Amino acid sequence: AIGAAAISAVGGIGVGWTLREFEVVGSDDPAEGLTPDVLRNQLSDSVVKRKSNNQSTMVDNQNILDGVEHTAYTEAKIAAIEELNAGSSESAVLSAANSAIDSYETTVRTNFYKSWNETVRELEAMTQTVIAHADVGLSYITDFGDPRFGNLASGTSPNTLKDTTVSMPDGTNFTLLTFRHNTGWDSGNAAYSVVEYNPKEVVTSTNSNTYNTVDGTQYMKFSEWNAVETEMDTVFQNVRNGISTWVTNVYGDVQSGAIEISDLVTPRERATMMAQEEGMSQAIADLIALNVPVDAEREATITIQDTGATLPGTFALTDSSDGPLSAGQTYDPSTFSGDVYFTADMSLVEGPWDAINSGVDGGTITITSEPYEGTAIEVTTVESETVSVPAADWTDNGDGTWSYDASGDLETTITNVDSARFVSTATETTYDTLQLKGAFTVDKLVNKQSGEEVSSTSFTSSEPQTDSNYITQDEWDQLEQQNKELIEKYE
Ligand SMILES: [Br-]
Ligand SMILES: [Br-]
Ligand SMILES: [Br-]
Ligand SMILES: [Br-]
Ligand SMILES: [Br-]
Ligand SMILES: [Br-]
Ligand SMILES: [Br-]
Ligand SMILES: [Br-]
Ligand SMILES: [Br-]
Ligand SMILES: [Br-]
Ligand SMILES: [Br-]
Ligand SMILES: [Br-]
Ligand SMILES: [Br-]
């Protein structure tokens, strides 16, 4: 429930890992000649960045996993129909369908385990850095509850990355890294602390916490990683059992040639082609491909209660039963059954900055709250002069106040702040998909072309795939038609 400083919403959501081979985000290596304070800040920043990345892609996209089931059913049914039309044996029909599931599951699982492996490899690289600098304690980077490294040998890591073989459905083996951590004491000591886990299971936990705590940030949470793992197992079990029930009831009665899907462009295929040539943001194209109810016809101007930030953009609900999002109404996403996704241009982000001191003493402007990353505070003085200050230029006083010296920017250095507002630092139109976590109010709902002001929202999605549906050509024709006109609406 933590994202862009300006919006409680989890930002930079990447759902592409459920539809394509996803490349992991690499580790940042700090310099040799560094100060303990600088190393601690750089390590804390890397942990925050890694957790934020993992939240947006794997960890916080739980309610879109029913879409993975939909994608897996589409792909397997097409493979099965081709075999049924060829007058093949029931085993050959199921073989083609399950080979499609095997390749799809391998991709989804490999992407998921690859991101865990990178998180765990990064921690080791960060641990090795702390060991080498010798000005920072291991208790800073590896804290599992009892970070007492008094009996651990010099130049030795308390971590061990164990190779664990995962049997991928396509017959191949994948090396999943099992994270083991031992503080160094003997079994018998009261201080003895050991943890060993991965997204699949907790091997051993002694005087330990699965998750790591670095500068107050809890990450590598087994409960978070295992939640996605157990849901992934559920989804692919349901597809395989469902396709078995489907073929058993469809074999013989559905005539060979009744359904012709050989040239069909699947919602998954449609979204992957968007990557080659992008006419819209990838995440909304992916959410459409996963059959998540979206509102393409309207444009909502939202305002965040706590922040004051206003944004125009398009909505997406994982559960359409979360009711219509009416204009003039205030909504708290913590109460909702599903997850709210908002796709909007970050450059347009704007809101009032009331947390500012009146006095401009010797050109110095002081603010009473942390400036938001990727935004600039536009300070207007009583002499009708304005100065744009990006967050990175605000110096922390450690008093809960931040200051900037505008002696080179203002004509009158000694003055009073008239008003202040925060605006985005983005040079161009930059689209982003956020998962709204904090309370928001829907200001206005603008129709897509005409510009009319509507009261409520209307979400649309194609027929969800079951173990007994997509028997008629009409069901399949509607799938391609409904999807291609949704993509057109965002272009
Ligand atoms: Br330094
Ligand atoms: Br597909
Ligand atoms: Br066919
Ligand atoms: Br890997
Ligand atoms: Br330390
Ligand atoms: Br120690
Ligand atoms: Br050990
Ligand atoms: Br000991
Ligand atoms: Br994480
Ligand atoms: Br946990
Ligand atoms: Br048949
Ligand atoms: Br819907
Ligand atoms: Br669905």
Residue numbers in the entry: 8 to 498
Question: What did the publication describing this PDB structure actually write?
Answer:
Haloarchaeal pleomorphic viruses (HRPVs) infect archaeal hosts living in hypersaline environments. The virions contain two major protein species, a spike protein (VP4 and VP4-like proteins) protruding from the membrane surface and a smaller membrane associated protein (VP3 and VP3-like proteins) residing mostly inside the virion. Here we describe crystallographic structures of VP4-like spike proteins from two pleolipoviruses, HRPV-2 and HRPV-6, showing that these proteins have a unique fold, different from class I–III fusion proteins. VP5 is thus a bona fide fusion protein.
In order to characterize the VP4-like fusion proteins (termed VP5 in these viruses) from HRPV-2 and HRPV-6, we purified them from infection-competent virions using either detergent (HRPV-2) or protease digestion (HRPV-6). After protein purification, we determined the structures of the HRPV-2 and HRPV-6 VP5 ectodomains (residues 1-498 out of 533 residues and 9-498 out of 537 residues) at 2.5 and 2.7 Å resolution, respectively, by X-ray crystallography. The two proteins, which are 67% identical in amino acid sequence, share a highly conserved V-shaped fold (r.m.s.d. for 453 corresponding Cα atoms: 1.6 Å). Surprisingly, the entire C-terminal domain is disordered in one of the two molecules of the asymmetric unit of HRPV-6 VP5. Although there is space in the crystal lattice to accommodate this disordered domain, the bulk of adjacent molecules prevents it from adopting the same orientation with respect to the N-terminal domain seen in the other copies of VP5. It appears that the N- and C-terminal domains can flex with respect to each other in the face of crystal packing forces. Analysis of proteinase K treated HRPV-6 particles by LC-MS/MS resulted in the identification of several peptides with core sequence FGVPGEVAV representing part of the predicted C-terminal transmembrane domain. The first twenty N-terminal residues of both VP5s are hydrophobic and predicted, by several programs for analysing hydrophobic regions of proteins, to form a transmembrane helix, indicating the preference of this region to partition into membranes. Interestingly, this hydrophobic segment is shielded from the solvent in both crystal structures by the C-terminal domain. HRPV-2 and HRPV-6 VP5 proteins share an average 67% amino acid sequence identity with the N2 subdomain being the least conserved between the two spike proteins.
